[PDB]
Amino acid sequence: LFLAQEIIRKKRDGHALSDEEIRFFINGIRDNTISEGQIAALAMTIFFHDMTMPERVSLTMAMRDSGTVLDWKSLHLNGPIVDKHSTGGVGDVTSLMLGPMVAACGGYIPMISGRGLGHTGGTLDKLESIPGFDIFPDDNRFREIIKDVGVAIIGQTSSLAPADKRFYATRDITATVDSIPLITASILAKKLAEGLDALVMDVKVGSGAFMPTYELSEALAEAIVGVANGAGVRTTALLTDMNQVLASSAGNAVEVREAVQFLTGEYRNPRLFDVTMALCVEMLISGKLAKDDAEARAKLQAVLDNGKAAEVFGRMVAAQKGPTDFVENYAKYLPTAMLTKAVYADTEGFVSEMDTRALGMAVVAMGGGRRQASDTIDYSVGFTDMARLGDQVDGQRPLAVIHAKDENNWQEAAKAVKAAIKLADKAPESTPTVYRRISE
Amino acid sequence: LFLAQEIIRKKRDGHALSDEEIRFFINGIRDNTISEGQIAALAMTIFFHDMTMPERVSLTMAMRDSGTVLDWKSLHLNGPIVDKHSTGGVGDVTSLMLGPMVAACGGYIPMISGRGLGHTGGTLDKLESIPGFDIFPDDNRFREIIKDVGVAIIGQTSSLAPADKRFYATRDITATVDSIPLITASILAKKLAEGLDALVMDVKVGSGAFMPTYELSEALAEAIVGVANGAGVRTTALLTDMNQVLASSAGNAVEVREAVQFLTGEYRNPRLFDVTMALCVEMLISGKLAKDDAEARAKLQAVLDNGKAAEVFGRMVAAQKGPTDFVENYAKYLPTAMLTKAVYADTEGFVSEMDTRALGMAVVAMGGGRRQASDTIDYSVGFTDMARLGDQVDGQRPLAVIHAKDENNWQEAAKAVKAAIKLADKAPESTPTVYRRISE
Ligand SMILES: N=[N+]=N[C@H]1[C@@H](F)[C@H](n2ccc(=O)[nH]c2=O)O[C@@H]1CO
Ligand SMILES: N=[N+]=N[C@H]1[C@@H](F)[C@H](n2ccc(=O)[nH]c2=O)O[C@@H]1CO
C-alpha cells in the first residue's frame, strides 16, 4: 500500500510513513521493483525530514525481515547469543579479542562483520590475512562452529538483510550515508538478523570517527539503543575515543599479530585494553552472564589469565579453516612486508594531534585497503609501534614503524604519517577512552 | 569539477552550485556517466533548497547546450523566430491556430511540442489524428517547411536537449516534477534550443492546471520570463484560466476539428479565442511585428478574416505529409467515433464547478490518452459541445456530447463527466480568461 512514488511524495512533504508503506518500499528494494532513483529520492527525503521512532523501528524491522534471520533456540545452547558492532576506526581490532573473551565466559557470538570502508579497517579483511581463513562458511557449518567454539566471524551472505545491499549501495553514491535513521536501520538490520539476545554498540567519537561531533555520535548511539531494545535485544552503547589509533598497529596482518599478542599477554595496548574490556563487560551484563561490572571484569580477566580466551581464538581460526597451530605459530603464517622501517618526526616534541582519518587513508594508499571494490589488498602493509598522544618523540621514539610492499611505497607512507601528526612543546590534556554508556 | 556525489552533497547542505558544477552534472546525465540515483538525489536537494537565479540560468543553459541547438540566421528569413509554450490543460488547442496566425503575420514558428501527459492533452497527439501528418521530419526538411510555410509543429528528436530526457524521466518517478527551477529548466532547455528571437509562455491557473495555486503559477511564470530574457530571447508570460475546458472540445480529432472551424470562422469558442489572441499578441509585440496591442490585434484579426491563417494551416498540414485538401475536406479524414451521444445532467441548473483534472482523466480512460507510454490512442474519442461555467443545463442543453469507441466505454465516460461537474441554482462569478501578463 502501495505506490513507490506516492510514498516518496508523502515523505517529501513531511508526513510520517506507516509501517505498511515502509515494509512495501523495503520489499520493492529487495525484489528490484523499486529503482535506484526511487531509493535515492526516499533516502534524501529521510535526510531532510528525519524519521520518528515508530518510523525508525519500522525501517529497521523491514530491512531485518527482508532476508534470512538466524535462530539459535533449536541448538539448545546454554548461554546467551550476544554480539558487538563498531562504527569503525583505525586500529579498531577489538572484535578479534572480544569474541573469544566473551565465548570463553559462556556467550555465543555469531559475528557478521564487514570489510574496510573509506578510511577505516575491516575485521573481515584483517582475518583474511590468515591463510585459509574462511569468512563464508555454509549455514550449517556456521551453526556447527558457534555450537562447538562459541564464536565465528563471517561476512554478510546474499540472503542476509538483502534490502540493505541496494539501499547502502545507493546511499554511498548519493550523499545519503550521513543520516541517523538510515545508519541505525542499516546497522541493526544486519545485527538483528543474527537472532541475538544481547548487543553492544561501539560508537566512535573524534577525528577517526564517522559522526562529525560528539553530540551526533551520542544521538546515533541513542537511536541504535532505542531500536534494538524495542526488538527485545538487550542493548547498550559505549561512546569511545578515535582521536588516535586505538591499537598500536593499523593494517591487516599487523593487527592480527597485535590481537594474538594481546590474548597471550605478550603486549596489551592500554587504551585498546580499556575499550575491549568495557565492551566485553556490556556483553556479559546484558547477556546475564554477570550481575555487575566488577564480576564481569573478574570473569574476563580470568579467561585472559588462564589462556582460555587465546585457546578459543585458536579454535575459531582452526574451525574457519585457518591453521590448527595459528596462535603458537602465527609468525610463519602472517605475511611479512618487503620493507619495514621506522618513520621519525622532523622535530622533537610531544605527540599532540593525530588526524586519524588521514592515517587510515595512508594505509589505504599503501595498498592495505581499497579505493574501489575490485582493489586487491596487500595484507602485510601498515603501521606498528604507533606513537600515542602525549608520547615524547625523538631519535629514540619514532612516530610509527611502517611496513611497506616496496621502497617507493614506504616514502609515500612516511610523508603521510608525518603530515597527519602534530607535535607540541607540551603533552595534550588526557581524554577518556570511554566517554559514556547509553542504555535503554 | 567534478564529482557527482560531491555536487549532490554541496547542494544537500544548502550551498549554491557553480556554473561549472552544474554543467559537469548535466553533461554526466547526457553521457550516462551519472546514475539514476544521482539524478534523483540532486533533484530532491533542489526540491528542498531551491535554486538562486544564477543557478536556474546555469541549469537551463547547460540543458539547452546538451544537444542540438537550431540556428535560423543562415536562411536569411525576413521575420522573427518566435514560439509559444503552454503548461498544458484540457481543450488547450491554441497552438493549432496560433502557429498559423502568427506565421500569416510574418513570424517563423519552429514549434517543438509534446504528447499528452497525466491528465492533459498533447498537441502532437492531436496532430497525429490527421492521416499522414509527420511530427518527425528530418532536419533539412524541417528547415524547408519553416522557410516555405512559416510554421511546423514537431516532436523532440533524440538530439534535442538530451539531458532533459533522463532528467524528466527520473523526476516523473521520484516526486521531483513539482519544482519551479526544474520545470523552468526543462521547459526552456527545449524551447531555447529552437534558436528563438521571442517566446510567449502560457502558464495555466486553476483545477486543470499543474501548479496548485495562483501564486505558484505566478512564481513559475516569473522564473521562466527571467531565465529566457537573460538568454536574449524576448519573453513574456500570460497566466490563463484552466477552471474549465478551454475549447468546446477535448480529445484529438475533435480538437483538430475545432481548430479548423475556428480558422475558417464557422465557430469560435470565445474563451479559446481570447486566450489564443492574447498569446498571439505577445508574440507579435515581442517579435517586433507590431508596436502595440491594438496594432497586433488588427493584424491577427485580418489574417483570420481574409482566410490567410486557415491557408497557412492547410499548407503546414500538407508540408508535414497530411492531405493537401485537409482544410476543405477534414470531415472525411478525421476519424469518427463508434458512438456519439449527449450526456445530460441529472438535475436542472447552472454549471457551477468543473473539475478539469477529472475531465482530462475521463478522456484518458476513454482511450483518448495514455496511462503508460506504450498505450495506443483512439483518435476519435473525447468530448464536444462542452457546457461552460454559467450555462443553464436541462433537457435541451447537455453537459457534453461524448464520442466513444463502443457503448460500454460511453457509459463510463458519462458517469465521469457527471461526477466532475457541479450544478448550482445561480451562475458562478465571472473570472478573467487572462489573469495577468508577466514581462522582464
Ligand atoms: N557511524 N556511522 N556511519 C558509518 C557506518 F555506520 C555506515 N554504514 C556502514 C556500512 C553499512 O552497511 N551501512 C551503514 O550505514 O556508513 C558510515 C561509513 O562507514
Ligand atoms: N507547470 N508545470 N509542470 C508540468 C510541466 F511543465 C512539467 N514538464 C513537462 C514536460 C517536460 O518535459 N518537462 C517538464 O518539466 O511537468 C508538469 C506536468 O506536465
Q: Which H or E element spans position B423?
A: strand B421-424
Alpha-carbon distances of B252 from A407, B96, B153, B335, rounded to whole Å:
75, 12, 15, 10
Closest C-alpha among A268, A238, A252, A326 to residue A97 = A268
- 3-state secondary structure labels for all residues of chain A: CCCHHHHHHHHHCCCCCCHHHHHHHHHHHHCCCCCHHHHHHHHHHHHHHCCCHHHHHHHHHHHHCCCCCCCCHHHCCCCCEEEEEECCCCCCCHHHHHHHHHHHCCCEEEEECCCCECCECCHHHHHCCCCCCCCCCCHHHHHHHHHHHCEEEECCCCCCCHHHHHHHHHHCCCCCCCCHHHHHHHHHHHHHCCCCCEEEEEEEECCCCCCCCHHHHHHHHHHHHHHHHHCCCEEEEEEEECCCCCCCCEECHHHHHHHHHHHHCCCCCHHHHHHHHHHHHHHHHHCCCCCCHHHHHHHHHHHHHCCHHHHHHHHHHHHCCCCCCHHHHHHHHCCCCCEEEEECCCCCEEEEEECHHHHHHHHHHHHHCCCCCCCCCCCCCEEECCCCCCCEEECCECCEEEEECCHHHHHHHHHHHHHHEEEECCCCCCCCCEEEEECC
Sign of CA dihedral B112, B117, B123, B127: positive
- In the reported structure, the alpha carbon of residue A183 is separated from the centroid of ligand 1 by a whole-number distance in angstroms of 6
- Choosing from B115, B191, B299, B405, the catalytic residue is B191
Nearest by CB to B175, from A12, A35, A48: name it.
Answer: A12
Q: Which residues contact A373 (CB under 8 A, 6 or more apart)?
A: none
Give the mutation candidate from A32, A35, A44 for the B interface (greatest B CB count, under 10 A): A44
Short-list A56, A23, A21, CA closest to A227: A56
d(CA A208, CA A363): 13
Please classify residue A214 by burial: count the beta carbons closer than 10 Å to its beta carbon, then call 0-12 exposed, 13-18 middle and 19+ buried: middle
> B189: Cβ–Cβ under 8 A, 6 or more apart, which residues?
B60, B63, B64, B66, B161, B163, B164
Q: How is residue B164 written as a grid cell? A: 532533459
Torsion of CA A55, A60, A62, A63, to 10 degrees: 140
Q: Do B174 and A36 touch (CB under 8 A)?
A: no
The cell 526543462 sits on which residue? B186
Does B175 contact A47 at a Cβ distance shorter than 8 Å? no
Give the bridge partners for A268, in sequence order: none
Please answer whether residues B120 and B206 qualify as being in contact, where contact means their C-beta atoms are separated by less than 8 angstroms: no
Contact residues of ligand 1, CB 6 A cut-off: A 87-88, 117-118, 168, 177, 183, 186-187, 210-211, 220
Q: How far is CA A171 from CA A47, A60, A64, A333, B254, in A?
A: 10, 16, 18, 38, 49
List of chain A residues whose C-beta atoms are within 8 Å of the C-beta of residue B9: 175
The torsion defined by the Cα of B405, B408, B413 and B415, in degrees rounded to 10, comes to: 170
Residue matched to cell numbers 597485535 = A258
- CA-based nearest residue to A44, from B223, B189, B170, B58: B170
Which residues lie below 8 Å from residue B410, measured CB to CB, with a gap of 6+? B339, B341, B402, B404
For residue A303, list its beta bridge partners: none
Which residues of B are less than 8 Å from A40 in CB distance?
Answer: 36-38, 40-41, 44, 174
Q: A1-69+156-193: CATH homologous superfamily?
A: Transferase, Pyrimidine Nucleoside Phosphorylase; Chain C (1.20.970.10)
Strand-strand pairing, B392-393 and B349-354: antiparallel
- Tell me the shortest Cα–Cα distance from A415 to chain B, in angstroms: 26
Which of B65, B83, B125, B355 is the catalytic position? B83
B40: chain A residues, CB-CB within 8 Å: 36-38, 40-41, 44, 174
Q: What whole-number distance in Å separates Cα of residue B421 and Cα of residue B347?
A: 12
Domains A1-69+156-193 and A337-433 share a fold: no
Tell how many helices (H) and how many strands (E) occur in chain B.
17, 13
Helix (H) or strand (E) holding B84: strand B82-86
Does an H or E element contain B85, and which?
A: strand B82-86
**Residue B342: which region, alpha, beta or left (left: phi > 0; alpha: psi -120 to 50)?**
beta
Quick one: cell of B183?
520545470
CA separation, residue A125 to residues A67, A261, A344, A361 (Å): 24, 19, 28, 15
Beta carbons of B36 and A35 less than 8 Å apart: yes
If DSSP codes are grouped into helix, strand and coil, which group holds residue B393? strand
Ligand closest to A165 (CA) is: 1
Alpha-carbon gap, residue B84 to B109, rounded angstroms: 8
Matching residue, cell 540543458: B63
Q: What is the DSSP letter of B374?
A: T
Catalytic, out of A123, A170, A240, A276? A123
Question: What is the C-alpha separation between A439 and A201, in angstroms, rounded?
Answer: 10
Query: How far is it, in rounded angstroms, from Cα B166 to Cα B169?
Result: 5
Contact between residue B145 and residue B319 where contact means Cβ atoms under 8 Å apart: yes
C-alpha cell, B90: 484540457
| Option in A35, A43, A176 nearest B173 (CB) | A35
Annotation says A73 is catalytic = no
Edge-first strand order for the sheet with A250-251 is A250-251, A382-384, A400-404, A339-343
Q: Where are the domains of chain A?
A: 1-69+156-193, 70-155+194-336, 337-433
Say whether residue B188 is in contact with chain A using an 8 A CB cutoff: no
**Widest CA span in chain B:** 69
Is B403:B382 a contact under the CB 8 Å cutoff? yes
Question: Considering the domain B337-433, what is its CATH architecture?
Answer: Alpha-Beta Complex (3.90)
The closest-lying atom of ligand 2 relative to the alpha carbon of residue B183 is 15
Q: Which cell numbers in the block locate residue A415?
A: 610523508
User: Quick check: bond before A142 cis, omega within 30?
Assistant: no
- Residues across chain B: 440
Alpha-carbon span A62 to A19, nearest angstrom: 8
Report d(CA A111, CA A151) in Å as an integer: 7
Q: How far is CA B285 from the centre of its chain?
A: 21
State how far the Cα of A37 lies from the Cα of B171, in Å rounded to an integer.
9
- Which residues in chain B touch residue A39, judged by CB atoms under 8 angstroms apart? 37
CATH number belonging to the domain at B70-155+194-336, selected among 1.10.150.80, 3.40.50.300, 3.40.630.30, 3.40.1030.10: 3.40.1030.10
- Check if the beta carbon of residue A379 is closer than 8 Å to that of residue A128: yes
Reduced to 3 states, what is the DSSP secondary structure of residue B406? coil
Q: Which residues contact B218 (CB under 8 A, 6 or more apart)?
A: B203, B239, B436, B438
**Separation between Cα atoms, residue B247 and residue B386, nearest integer Å:** 8
Total residue count of chain A as it appears in this document: 440
Strands A234-241, A198-205: pairing kind: parallel
Q: How far is B34 from chain A (nearest CA, A)?
A: 10
Which H or E element spans position B203?
strand B198-205
C-alpha dist (Å) from residue B205 to A204, B218, B308: 54, 9, 32
The alpha-carbon gap from A38 to the nearest alpha carbon of chain B, in Å, equals 5
Instruction: Evaluate: CB of B177 within 6 angstroms of ligand 2.
Output: yes
Nearest residue CA, atom 15 of ligand 2? B183
